[PDB]
Amino acid sequence: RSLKKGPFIDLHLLKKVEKAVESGDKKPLRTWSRRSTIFPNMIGLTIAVHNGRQHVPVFVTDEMVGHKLGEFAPTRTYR
């Protein structure tokens, strides 16, 4: 998928993950950064990942590490 020379993460979301650890668990973290790889320092947080219209809150688990935030936010409605 991506070259082994550094996984990607948005600085605005990375600083939001840093602010949430020290200040303690808050309300769902409203972010549009779907292109970021999940790091171990995220497990237990509630991240609100955009789908195009609404922010989908996804509880970060240990198995979710390595995967992208946009995988847990379906973009197209089908019924």
Partner 1 sequence: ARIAGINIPDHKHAVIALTSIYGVGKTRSKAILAAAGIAEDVKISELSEGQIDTLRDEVAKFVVEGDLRREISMSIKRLMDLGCYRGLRHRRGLPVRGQRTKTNARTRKGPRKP
Partner 2 sequence: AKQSMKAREVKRVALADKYFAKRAELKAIISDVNASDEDRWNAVLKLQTLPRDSSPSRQRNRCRQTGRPHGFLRKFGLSRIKVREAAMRGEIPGLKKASW
Separation of alpha carbons 43 and 57, rounded Å: 14
Coil vs helix vs strand at 28: coil
- Compute, in degrees rounded to 10, the torsion defined by CA atoms 58, 60, 64, 4: 110
Is residue 27 within the footprint of RNA (CB under 7 A)? no
Piece in contact with partner 2 (CB under 8 A), picked from 7-15, 40-48, 50-58, 61-69:
7-15
2-61: which residues touch partner 1 (CB under 8 A)? 58, 61
Is residue 67 within the footprint of partner 1 (CB under 8 A)? yes
Q: Which residues bind partner 2 (CB under 8 A)?
A: 5-6, 8, 10-11, 14
